[PDB]
Design a protein around this ligand. Structure first.
Ligand SMILES: CC(C)[C@H]1Cc2cc(F)ccc2S(=O)(=O)N(C[C@@H](O)[C@H](Cc2ccccc2)NC(=O)NC(C)(C)C)C1
Ligand SMILES: [Cl-]
Ligand SMILES: [Cl-]
Ligand SMILES: [Cl-]
Lengths: 99, 99
């Protein structure tokens, strides 16, 4: 698909047996999701955005589905104001910027 | 161009006759640049991101070139960690997400 940028590029994702709305964010290095349970081991991490840093839990090797496209990667879980799909997963679905 | 996301989508921009590096950011509604001098009057604005908010100065109708593509629009100036080209200008240069 081709997604325009007149409004926020929000998509439905499937993660940890849940459906969530998330933002396709080329400015995010990492994928960051609001509080939820994920299986497996995790370690703490600090990530910095515009307003400073937040503490998140880092889960590795998590399968996500974005627009029928399956991918696997690290997912950070914490107090993000919006669920964000970052470059670590955008690359896996073959997402590019075009102009 | 077609830009992949294996690395940050950093491009050269020109604003006020000066070259700067900035991130093409589909997750940013607005364009935010680090402290610099711009002409005219400014209006107040708050930008909320991960970690909280920053207060910025809103300048309207500013000439800005992005990777050689000319745009004229709103530029926010403030204590952002990185120069960000948001959707307001990505639409002016005809940028889309594709997969
Ligand atoms: C709608 C919200 C999502 C957006 C809110 C937002 C809205 C705007 F109008 C302008 C900027 C921003 S932002 O910069 O706060 N940001 C865009 C993101 O792409 C940032 C850009 C960035 C990169 C590096 C340092 C500072 C900012 N990345 C970002 O937040 N990355 C992590 C991994 C922390 C999620 C989130
Ligand atoms: Cl990853
Ligand atoms: Cl590729
Ligand atoms: Cl604008």
């Amino acid at each position: 698909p081709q997604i325009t940028l007149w409004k926020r590029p929000l998509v439905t994702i499937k993660i940890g047996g849940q459906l969530k709305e998330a933002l396709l964010d080329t400015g995010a290095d990492d994928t960051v999701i609001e509080e939820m349970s994920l299986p497996g081991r995790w370690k703490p991490k600090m990530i910095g955005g515009i307003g400073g840093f937040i503490k998140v839990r880092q889960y590795d090797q998590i399968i996500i589905e974005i627009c029928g496209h399956k991918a696997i990667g690290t997912v950070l879980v914490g107090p993000t104001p919006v669920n964000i799909i970052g470059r670590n997963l955008l690359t896996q679905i073959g997402c590019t910027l075009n102009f």
